[PDB]
CSV table of C-alpha atoms in Angstrom, one decimal:
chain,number,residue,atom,x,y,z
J,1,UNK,CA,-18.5,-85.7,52.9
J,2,UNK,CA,-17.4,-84.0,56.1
J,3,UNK,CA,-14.8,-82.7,58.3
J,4,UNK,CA,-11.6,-84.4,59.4
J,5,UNK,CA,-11.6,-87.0,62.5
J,6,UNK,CA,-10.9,-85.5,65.6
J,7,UNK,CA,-8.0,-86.4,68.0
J,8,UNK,CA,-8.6,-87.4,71.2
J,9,UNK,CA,-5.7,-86.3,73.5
J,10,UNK,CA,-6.6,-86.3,77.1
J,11,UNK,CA,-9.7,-87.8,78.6
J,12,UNK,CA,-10.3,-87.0,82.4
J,13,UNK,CA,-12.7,-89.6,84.0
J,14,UNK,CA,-14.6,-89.6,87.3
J,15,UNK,CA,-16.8,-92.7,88.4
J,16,UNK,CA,-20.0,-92.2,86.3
J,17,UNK,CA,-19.0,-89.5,83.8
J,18,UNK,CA,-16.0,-88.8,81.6
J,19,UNK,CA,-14.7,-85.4,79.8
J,20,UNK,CA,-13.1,-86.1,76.7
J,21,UNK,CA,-10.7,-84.0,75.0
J,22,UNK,CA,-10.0,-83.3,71.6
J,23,UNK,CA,-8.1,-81.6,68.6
J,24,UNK,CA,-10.0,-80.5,65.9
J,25,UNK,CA,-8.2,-78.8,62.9
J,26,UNK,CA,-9.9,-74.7,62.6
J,27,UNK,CA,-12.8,-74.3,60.4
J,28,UNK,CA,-11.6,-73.0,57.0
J,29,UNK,CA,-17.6,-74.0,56.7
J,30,UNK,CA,-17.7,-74.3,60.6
J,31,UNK,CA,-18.2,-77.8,62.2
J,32,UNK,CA,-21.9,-77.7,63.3
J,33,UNK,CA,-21.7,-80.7,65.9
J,34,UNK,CA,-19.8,-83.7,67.1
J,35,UNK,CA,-20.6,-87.1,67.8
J,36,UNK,CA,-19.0,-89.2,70.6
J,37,UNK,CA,-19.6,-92.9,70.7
J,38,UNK,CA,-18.4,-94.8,73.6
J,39,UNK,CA,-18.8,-98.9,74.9
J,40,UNK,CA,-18.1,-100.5,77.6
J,41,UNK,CA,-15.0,-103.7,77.9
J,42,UNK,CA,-17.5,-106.9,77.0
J,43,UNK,CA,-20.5,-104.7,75.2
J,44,UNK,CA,-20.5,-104.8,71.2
J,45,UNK,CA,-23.4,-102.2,70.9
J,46,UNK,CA,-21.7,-98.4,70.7
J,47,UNK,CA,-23.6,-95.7,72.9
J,48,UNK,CA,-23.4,-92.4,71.4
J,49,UNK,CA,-24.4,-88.8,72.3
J,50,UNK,CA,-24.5,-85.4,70.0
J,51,UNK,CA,-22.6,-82.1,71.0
J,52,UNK,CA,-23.1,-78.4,69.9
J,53,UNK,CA,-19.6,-77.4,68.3
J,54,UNK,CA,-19.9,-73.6,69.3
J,55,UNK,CA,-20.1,-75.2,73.1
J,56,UNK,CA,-17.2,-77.8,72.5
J,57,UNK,CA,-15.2,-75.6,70.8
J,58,UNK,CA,-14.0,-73.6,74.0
J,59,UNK,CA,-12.1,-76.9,75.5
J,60,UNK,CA,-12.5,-79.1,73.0
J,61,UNK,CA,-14.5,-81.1,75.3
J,62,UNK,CA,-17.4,-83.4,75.2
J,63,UNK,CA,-18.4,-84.7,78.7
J,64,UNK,CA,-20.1,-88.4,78.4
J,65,UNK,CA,-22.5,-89.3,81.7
J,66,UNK,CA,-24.2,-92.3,83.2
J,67,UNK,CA,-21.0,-94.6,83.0
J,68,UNK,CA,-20.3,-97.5,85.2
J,69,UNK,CA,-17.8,-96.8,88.5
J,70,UNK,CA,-14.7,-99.0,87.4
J,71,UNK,CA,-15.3,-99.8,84.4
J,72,UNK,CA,-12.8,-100.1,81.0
J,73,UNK,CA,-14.7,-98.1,78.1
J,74,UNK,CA,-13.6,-97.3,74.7
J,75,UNK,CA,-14.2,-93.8,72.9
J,76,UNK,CA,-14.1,-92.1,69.7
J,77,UNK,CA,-15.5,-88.9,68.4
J,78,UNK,CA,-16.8,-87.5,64.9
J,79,UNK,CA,-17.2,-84.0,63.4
J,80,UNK,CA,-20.0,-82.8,61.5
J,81,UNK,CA,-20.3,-79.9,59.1
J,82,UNK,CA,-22.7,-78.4,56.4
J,83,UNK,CA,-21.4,-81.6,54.3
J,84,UNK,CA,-22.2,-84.1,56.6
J,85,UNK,CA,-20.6,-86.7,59.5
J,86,UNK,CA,-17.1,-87.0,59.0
J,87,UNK,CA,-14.9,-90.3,59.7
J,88,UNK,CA,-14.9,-91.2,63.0
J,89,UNK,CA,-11.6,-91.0,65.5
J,90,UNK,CA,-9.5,-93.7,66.3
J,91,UNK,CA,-10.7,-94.9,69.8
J,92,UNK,CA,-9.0,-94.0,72.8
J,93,UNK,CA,-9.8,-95.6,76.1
J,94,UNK,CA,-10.4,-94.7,79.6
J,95,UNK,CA,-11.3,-96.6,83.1
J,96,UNK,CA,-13.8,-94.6,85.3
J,97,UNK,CA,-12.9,-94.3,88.6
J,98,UNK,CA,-15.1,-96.2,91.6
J,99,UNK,CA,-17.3,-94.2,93.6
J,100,UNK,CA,-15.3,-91.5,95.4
J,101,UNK,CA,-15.3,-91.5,99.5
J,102,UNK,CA,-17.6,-89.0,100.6
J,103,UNK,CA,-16.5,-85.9,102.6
């Protein structure tokens, strides 16, 4: 039905974006995409973006934009392959950071 969850394991966040990384276990049938999903602390609706897994694959990154400057979100990720979306990640959090003092 699809490839395994990924782990999230470090996520680096600035005051509007965030880059989220990941394990992923090596194709054995390469994963084609991943999904993130990610929500805000008092939002119920997840938002959610797509990512080319060739591009990913060198960091196991996905980078998510137009978050809020200090603001609590939770985030998970999902692999997809030739046999469709797998099962989602177990969310990780992060808190972006306010609007850095210019230089």
């Amino acid at each position: 039905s699809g490839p395994s969850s990924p782990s999230i394991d470090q996520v680096e966040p600035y005051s509007s974006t965030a880059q989220v990384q990941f394990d992923e276990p090596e194709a054995t049938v390469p994963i084609l995409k991943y999904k993130a999903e990610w929500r805000a602390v008092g939002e119920e609706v997840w938002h959610s973006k797509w990512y080319d897994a060739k591009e990913a694959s060198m960091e196991g990154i996905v980078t998510i934009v137009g978050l809020k400057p200090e603001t609590t979100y939770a985030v998970r990720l999902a692999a997809l392959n030739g046999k469709g979306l797998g099962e989602i990640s177990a969310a990780s959090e992060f808190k972006t950071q306010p609007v850095r003092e210019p230089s």
